[PDB]
Amino acid sequence: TSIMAVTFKDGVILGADSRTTTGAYIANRVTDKLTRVHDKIWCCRSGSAADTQAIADIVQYHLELYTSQYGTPSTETAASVFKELCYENKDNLTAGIIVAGYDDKNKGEVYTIPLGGSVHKLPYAIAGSGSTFIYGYCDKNFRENMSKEETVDFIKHSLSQAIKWDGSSGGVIRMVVLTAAGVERLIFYPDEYEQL
Amino acid sequence: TTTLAFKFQHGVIVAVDSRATAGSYISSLRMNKVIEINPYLLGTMSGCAADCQYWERLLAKECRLYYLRNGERISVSAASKLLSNMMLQYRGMGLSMGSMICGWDKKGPGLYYVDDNGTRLSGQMFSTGSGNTYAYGVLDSNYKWDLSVEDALYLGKRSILAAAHRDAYSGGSVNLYHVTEDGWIYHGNHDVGELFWKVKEEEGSFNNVIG
Amino acid sequence: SDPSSINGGIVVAMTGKDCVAIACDLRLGSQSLGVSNKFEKIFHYGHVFLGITGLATDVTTLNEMFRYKTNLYKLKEERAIEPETFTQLVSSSLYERRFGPYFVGPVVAGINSKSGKPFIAGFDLIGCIDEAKDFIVSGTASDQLFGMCESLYEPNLEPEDLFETISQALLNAADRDALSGWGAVVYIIKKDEVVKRYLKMRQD
Amino acid sequence: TTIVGVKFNNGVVIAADTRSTQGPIVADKNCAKLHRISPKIWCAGAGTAADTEAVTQLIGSNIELHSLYTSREPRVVSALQMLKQHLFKYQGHIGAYLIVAGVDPTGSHLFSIHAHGSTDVGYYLSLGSGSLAAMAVLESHWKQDLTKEEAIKLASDAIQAGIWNDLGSGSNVDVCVMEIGKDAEYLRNYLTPNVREEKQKSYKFPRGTTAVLKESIVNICDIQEE
Amino acid sequence: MDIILGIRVQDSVILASSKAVTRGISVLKDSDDKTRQLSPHTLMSFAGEAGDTVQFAEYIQANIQLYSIREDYELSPQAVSSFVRQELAKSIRSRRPYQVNVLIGGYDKKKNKPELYQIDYLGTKVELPYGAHGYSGFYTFSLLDHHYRPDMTTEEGLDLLKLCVQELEKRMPMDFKGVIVKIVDKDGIRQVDDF
Amino acid sequence: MDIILGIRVQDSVILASSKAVTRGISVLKDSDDKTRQLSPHTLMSFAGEAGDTVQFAEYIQANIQLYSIREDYELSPQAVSSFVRQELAKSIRSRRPYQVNVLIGGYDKKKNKPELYQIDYLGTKVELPYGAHGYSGFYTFSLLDHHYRPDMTTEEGLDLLKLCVQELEKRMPMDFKGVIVKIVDKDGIRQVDDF
Amino acid sequence: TQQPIVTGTSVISMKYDNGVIIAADNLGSYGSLLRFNGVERLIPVGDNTVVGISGDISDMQHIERLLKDLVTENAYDNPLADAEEALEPSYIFEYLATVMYQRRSKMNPLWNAIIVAGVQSNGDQFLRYVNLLGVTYSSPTLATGFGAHMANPLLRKVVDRESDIPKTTVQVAEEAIVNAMRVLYYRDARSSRNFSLAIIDKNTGLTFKKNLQVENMKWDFAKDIKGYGTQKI
Amino acid sequence: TQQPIVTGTSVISMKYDNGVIIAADNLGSYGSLLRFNGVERLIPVGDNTVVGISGDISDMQHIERLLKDLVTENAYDNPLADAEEALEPSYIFEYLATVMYQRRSKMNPLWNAIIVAGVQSNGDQFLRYVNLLGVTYSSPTLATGFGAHMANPLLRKVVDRESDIPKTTVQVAEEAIVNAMRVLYYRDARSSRNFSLAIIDKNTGLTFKKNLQVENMKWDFAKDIKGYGTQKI
Amino acid sequence: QFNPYGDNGGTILGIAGEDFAVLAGDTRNITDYSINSRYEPKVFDCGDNIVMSANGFAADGDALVKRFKNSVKWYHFDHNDKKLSINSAARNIQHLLYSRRFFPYYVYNIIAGLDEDGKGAVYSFDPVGSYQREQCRAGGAAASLIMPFLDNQVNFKNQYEPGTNGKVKKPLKYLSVEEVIKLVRDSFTSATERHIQVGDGLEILIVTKDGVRKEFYELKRD
């Protein structure tokens, strides 16, 4: 995997490749790694596919039950539930999750949860095997309060390079836009992003 | 394998089985485990078949050269020692060989046990292989120096049968030899399947087995 | 060390015309040492026959277990268990020990009392059912038995012809296995008569 | 094993080979890898044979009880959820690799499932030792808006690729078609391209060839009256 | 422990068991009795890991004695051997299995027949005319195969047993310090004090 | 091999060496002589890994016999023991060391004194009144410490040696099949045929 | 004994009526890193042979030099170096196979899998495989690494046995090879879009095609795929 | 049993005449990767204690929450929560030390090294260390990880024993701490330029300084250094 | 770590007739679960009316065959074009194999031809050079499947004459070349059904006084 989440003026955008591997075999070339845990709280998954699915399913259950009792949960609350699962079961899990969501009060927020189960709130985050190759690019090109179109280009260019160098990453670039307007899904095919 | 050999009044008896295994699979039903080195010299084989064949056939080369150089047959003691010295060159290299060098020379009948470690032992009676313990049981209780050629051949044959029955890695058939001062004499291949039933009826042994 | 090959032994079953046959060797050993030549590996619960190879303690244990279960079945159902139903019971019972299994290779043989249809089945140690039309093999000489059965077998054999085929399949397979032999038994099974024959074979 | 799943116009089709192995030996030449979870939900299994059967039967049993409880026809997403949570719990030790497909009131579905509990969605899927041979065929010939007849052809072609090119696969091709608004049709031995040729000789023995020691009648009947 | 033998003759069962007990490189005892009377006509000899042997034997003894009192009746050798086998087959899949091999010699008063059962630590039971555990059979079975008849007297059984022990004493590397021999027949259990 | 003992008395050296040879679980021989005469008044007993023992002993024997012929003179026991030690100390750092322990019993005709040297496979030499290799000393040294005098006769040395062998036969787990005893004195080397 | 560092993935090939085709991508991987994107793994020897190599690239470059030196050495004191006594595919293969087996026998292998494709003097097609173990085999279709698992099944649908070779044209064979390379790009995580292809024909000679790309790829169906099970959005 | 993933390096501290100083850089490393650059590893508890933590960051965040919960719990049914019955540095330390030793005794440690710095009710300076093993010790200077090897020697030149504490001013102590942080930046490969520093004084209270940087660095002499021995250019 | 050995599968079968001999082997070459070739010859004519097959690790098998063929060539040069008898070839091969006692040719080797009295001969070798003359021998992956069948159908083991009930054995009547080829084909057809490494094709080499003849038969390709 190559995954990332980036905050901007109107909210937050999640991005991911679509390659799932079993060694050098690509078990799925059109994987959806952007997963919904609440209406406007999504996550990017990296690590064990089984572990990250089981976690996200449990989180979705917790937030559905939270909503029934206390109303819409914050992005921070969602990240806490992820953390609690990842931290307390660190010995048996291999999960690297990025949590991203949109409130009207807090606007766009991004929380990354690496292997140990620590939480880190950031303007943007990158993770997965392919993220190593774009630390330099992303740090040099990221600005706060970008426009939607600028942020899409930033993610598109970043994941393009991650895919180019990482054999474990590839396929299509999926993106999920989280704003007050709603939820927008985007997809970008190889012929588009390879020529960048 | 089960092999045995023993000295007695009328020379030395040599009896071996004929089974060969590759794990639990019986690879061969009838393998020759005796080697004819010279009309007065025999060698048994137990352990790695390849090691047994190669080195004892090489011993025969060296025993033959002895005859050409000295115009006289090599002793059993000297032949066994040549073989033991070969094993000692490939010390710790992983050879698996257990053999008895049986023959008749100027000192009379001779019998030497030789193995991969280089051990070389003179003795009246020896038995090697996975089924040697079963053979020793019959041998020790029935052996005498005063045995007749007929009874001695039967003892070695019966002793292998005992091992072939109990030991899963021994069987097939029995090859008998008798060594005299006029040389060695082959006394045939005896199928254990047929021999067992025959011995059971005639001897009354193996009562627990149904037939 | 390998539990499935400490004691040794083999079982083979075949279908014929309105008949089935199941056979086994009689050896029980401790690796190289032969211990018993009377260790029968075929049991029956009513008209259903079960052959079991592998670890001898588990063979004995499972026989006692299926005797237990089939006797209760009969008391409650008021009828003898059938081969198809028993086969499922064997599978269920083996899989319940998925992560601590009995080291066995069971073989079911019998004729359905209602339909009259001949039936055989084999299992792996955890319960996977192998329901074959022709033959089933099990044991330390399973490779040997496959070779013999696959060439010797032909469908719709009569009871007295099937006897010769299964016997020769067993005997010659056992004679190429160090851990099998020391006697043999063959069951010939028809809808309402069963004949049991001990074979004469080499005892090495 | 080789197993595949292919989506089409108004439903989904799955297929499988019929070989089962124990080492390099073929245990069963005509085994059945297409399992029924519910009438219109079938799944094909690869991996540990008993695990694919047991996990399928367990979930199928619970799916039946669920269907009765809710007065509704079972859904594929339910079977999928129950299977993955069960397999995840056993941390891969239950070695079941399944392709789950079916039709329900929601529509037609096709999923794959690994032993560790990860699930996967697709229009065409393959699992088992011959999955690469099968996927090569699927990637070469699959297209959107397949007909029923085209999908069955693609599925069986994919299995054949496994049969011929993978030593872990062989014998026959099983198929099950699940179409919307119809009964699922299970096509056992849809193809039979591996019939053994006639033997050169008959090995039927003369009666009395085998040596016998004893004979006896076996009492299978119960204890008798009088 | 080391060597335990057993032979069933016409009208009795004879068990022979070694006397040695070794700790480290030193022989602590040369008069150890590796046997327990389970009932008046049933004797069990044992061999295996240190400690486990006696605990298991005494645990079996207690169970059979409890049964005898409860029912005022002696269990058949077959019934006892099955009980023992089950306890061992139960044990082998335990957290820490009991590493004990046994021979059960008994006289069935109902059938008027001697019976010898050989059971290893896995729960592998076999009824035999003669039996042994460990390496004992490797040396002795060839003699027993040859000399054994089912119509042998108790005295003939003892002579054949002497021959087996002599062969063991010749070809075994270990000194097992001779054997204690016990006879089980219709009149009960007795020890041969000179062997 | 197993047990080799040695005792130096007033006017002689006595070496006792076990007779057993074992391959696998079977005793192949019970009359093996674990000794070589190096010179008329020097005897060497040996124990260690199979094969190596005899090769080494015979190799030493050949070297000492070569020296004797070349110089027409018998090397002193001390000189021989030093030669042997050097060969072993040379061996221990070889690619494949010779795993042999030896006792060298000799009578020095110049000094008119018996001498006993104990040398292990590392080349560790010690002159002693009595010695042993392996586990033999664990059982026997307490008796020798108690009973040994330097003015003992050869007959007293044999009686003390019998006591040592009896203790070994009681407390050792292994059956070493008795010992061959040899005496080294002014008149040369001789074997005690009844022991 | 070593471990391969910079590696090349599948090499695929097949026979057709008048010759042979061989292809391989232009990637030099460094583990999961797609480090080098301009690596030629098909190496022509004369105008009648192409050697396709997979595995360790440093060992490939070594082999490339042995072959270059082989041509030089064959020309020495050889007036018929460009005619009757020119290097044949069978000569070049047997040389490499001798080297590979010798190196494995010294426990210092060339960590490669090689396919020698060419046309002999008499017009016969030559196609044979050899690897780090010195194992050799011939078939109407040959492939290394992933290609063996995915490409061979597709190529064997065109040429399933020897009798199918005369029935197969160069257009059909090239089409099949190019399709296989696309399939490998879909499914092999250590592959690249860019590849080279070589045709050795008994009439038209050696045609070496560089800078080829995998095209006509299907990705559009990805837009419909959502979540991993129950997710609808 | 685990392994630390995201880690924090040295924490250094020392006593002076009226209180204690503690400092730690703002880096969260992920092996050799300098992943997170805005991590606060000094955590104040009230206005009299600062807990400095090194090691696993996920475990640090856990401890941070235990301390936050400790303050909440101490205020329950406690009218003197902001006075006589407020949390003392010795209470906070002994709590953590109890937790650390219990966790190691269950073979599931908190993979940290902790220094609790503060001033007690009676004005006494408090400075004590505790780690994943439950090992505790006190000294006029304390440091974790690399700081123990490089910082302590520098800080012990200022306060070599107990009698040097009253002679050491806050200006001298801060100067020494800041110099040590520079030295660690020169020489520790898992350190950062940015750090935080806290002073707990018995008169002026708790002063918490964020966004500090290592300055006055010497690099100019590097221009003269050429090659590794014989090279002149 | 580098593993210099591999397993290319395959199965071979040698049967000695009264005045002929056959050496058969499947033509399938494999690694793990992949097929390398459906037709890769395994049995070779080595000259002097001798045929040989080295089954197991193909690289070592090819090397051994290559060296023996070479040994035949040099036997002619060194001994005035004398024909290499089958017994002499067998002994020569033992020494070829034992050269690598400590780094073996990982192959089970079989040769076939005629002895100096014109009768059929088969010799069998293990990887380290133990050899023996035999009447019937199967080697390779499916050897355990085939050998019991040959014990029964060639040497008539466990077969007795009807009516006698185990007292009189079935007499050991000789087999014709047509009868032997039937047993060979049925052996490989049965082995193909139950062993995954056996299939594709069967190539048989028949040796008589007239020379070496070949026969090929298709096998199941799954």
Ligand SMILES: *[C@@](C)(CO)[C@](*)(O)[C@H](Cc1ccccc1)NC(=O)[C@H](Cc1ccc(OC)cc1)NC(=O)[C@H](C)NC(=O)CN1CCOCC1
């Ligand atoms: C890229 C490819 C690699 O990091 C991504 O992280 C990707 C993320 C992803 C994939 C599918 C769905 C959502 C998100 N992860 C994988 O492709 C993942 C690789 C991986 C496996 C195991 C790991 O640690 C235990 C870490 C990363 N692939 C899988 O999980 C696949 C489906 N299954 C296997 O590889 C089987 N494994 C399971 C674990 O035990 C060994 C066998």
Ligand SMILES: *[C@@](C)(CO)[C@](*)(O)[C@H](Cc1ccccc1)NC(=O)[C@H](Cc1ccc(OC)cc1)NC(=O)[C@H](C)NC(=O)CN1CCOCC1
């Ligand atoms: C009985 C059968 C014990 O199995 C005998 O010792 C028998 C003796 C014998 C002597 C001459 C001719 C034939 C048989 N030994 C064997 O049959 C022997 C058993 C054995 C195998 C390996 C050993 O360690 C090296 C020791 C003993 N079997 C063989 O030699 C068989 C026929 N061949 C091989 O094992 C060859 N190996 C070589 C490496 O590749 C794997 C197979």
Ligand SMILES: *[C@@](C)(CO)[C@](*)(O)[C@H](Cc1ccccc1)NC(=O)[C@H](Cc1ccc(OC)cc1)NC(=O)[C@H](C)NC(=O)CN1CCOCC1
């Ligand atoms: C192909 C044949 C794999 O080679 C398929 O995946 C096939 C699937 C299948 C499904 C249902 C019914 C029949 C067949 N799987 C097998 O045939 C499977 C092969 C296998 C062996 C071992 C494995 O790892 C443990 C995984 C797969 N065969 C079996 O499960 C057979 C019947 N049983 C055994 O080999 C005994 N196993 C039990 C599990 O523990 C290891 C030994």
Ligand SMILES: [Mg+2]
């Ligand atoms: Mg990529």
Ligand SMILES: [Mg+2]
């Ligand atoms: Mg036997």
Ligand SMILES: [Mg+2]
């Ligand atoms: Mg047998």
Ligand SMILES: [Mg+2]
């Ligand atoms: Mg037992």
Ligand SMILES: [Mg+2]
């Ligand atoms: Mg096949």
